[PDB]
Design a protein around this ligand. Structure first.
Ligand SMILES: [Zn+2]
Length: 360
């Protein structure tokens, strides 16, 4: 019984002390939604987007910290690329003959994330005021993040970041045309079906000056990423009861956990987040698509090749977004070369010493 298997045991046992906070969170948010869906507003159609809630699906956060996405269908979007990489978008509209319901959130031709979020925040504050069963308030707006974060004080303080996402049922942006390269792994029928589902727009400022600040959006495929994580095998029975299990998720978990415990010890690693890990392993799953290449009896070999792949992404400063191939998450504009070299030396140290970081 090696350290890797014991770390996995530790991770799922540590998720036991999350489930009670998670039940609190689910009933707060479904009450808040049901309230928002009864009230008359631009957000009456809001719904929770289910993006998975296990360790593999969630961002790295403290045990009492949660994230949920509120989707809002927005018809007849007209996207304009803000970056040639596909990293950001301005949201305009095609002709809407009966009137754009979001007309009043516009700034010029562009949907203002600032205007939309401000009312999004206001309505929630009012509906959260009217929930008595449970002590729920809303944290004061933070610089930077667009999140409307609930403070649940059922004895222990629990935080919930609510993310507003626009849902568009139009075709996927031109920047995704050659993305989602699953043809040799999940197949062409799956790829065709996934690209027929909606996509989502999350408000996010770019670090580039005053112009269009508060008016920029980034793409989100969290619904697709959940499907892939839960349908990850070449065989349809992979990890099912009449099938064989692989170590794909286990590798993702170990890698997320390695980064998280490195990040809590080195501010140098601030630019790195769990999404870089998920992106890297999406590519490894495309490069090594056979279930037998992720056999559970080869966990440490599979973990190590994932590490060697990540290391090579750092060394060549290239990690293509899995859905937007022009969008390099490891470009120098986004992460200094010195942060990659620092992370590389931290990983090689952990790799060649039995992962001491895993013993705390
Ligand atoms: Zn599997």
């Amino acid at each position: 019984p090696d350290k890797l298997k014991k770390v996995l045991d530790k991770l799922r046992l540590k998720r036991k002390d999350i489930s009670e906070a998670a039940e609190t969170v689910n009933k707060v948010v479904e009450r808040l939604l049901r309230r928002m869906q009864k009230r008359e507003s631009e957000f009456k159609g809001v719904e929770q987007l289910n993006t998975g809630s296990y360790y593999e699906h969630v961002k790295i956060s403290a045990p009492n910290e949660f994230d949920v996405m509120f989707k809002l269908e927005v018809p007849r979007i007209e996207l304009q690329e803000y970056y040639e990489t596909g990293a950001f978008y301005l949201v305009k509209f095609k002709r809407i003959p009966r009137g754009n319901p979001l007309s009043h959130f516009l700034e010029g031709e562009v949907l203002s994330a600032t205007k939309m979020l401000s009312k999004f925040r206001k309505i929630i504050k009012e509906e959260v005021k009217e929930i008595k069963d449970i002590d729920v308030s809303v944290e004061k707006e933070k610089p930077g993040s667009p999140a409307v974060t609930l403070l649940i004080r059922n004895p222990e303080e629990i935080s919930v970041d609510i993310i507003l996402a626009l849902e568009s049922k139009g075709s996927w942006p031109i920047s995704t045309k050659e993305g989602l390269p699953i043809q040799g792994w999940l197949g062409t029928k799956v790829r065709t079906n996934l690209r027929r589902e909606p996509f989502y727009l999350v408000p996010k400022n770019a670090k580039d000056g005053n112009s269009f600040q508060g008016e920029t959006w980034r793409l989100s495929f969290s619904h697709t990423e959940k499907y892939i994580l839960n349908n990850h095998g070449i065989e349809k029975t992979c990890c099912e009861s009449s099938g064989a299990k692989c170590c794909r998720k286990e590798c993702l978990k170990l890698m997320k956990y390695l980064l998280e415990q490195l990040k809590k010890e080195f501010q140098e690693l601030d630019a790195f987040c769990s999404y870089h890990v998920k992106t890297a392993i999406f590519h490894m799953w495309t490069q090594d698509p056979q279930d037998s290449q992720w056999d559970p009896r080869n966990l440490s070999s599979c973990f190590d090749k994932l590490l060697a792949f990540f290391l090579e992404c750092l060394r060549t400063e290239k990690l293509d977004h899995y859905f937007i191939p022009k969008f390099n998450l490891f470009s120098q504009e986004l992460i200094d070369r010195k942060s990659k070299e620092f992370l590389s030396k931290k990983i090689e140290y952990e790799r060649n010493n039995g992962f001491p970081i895993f013993d705390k």
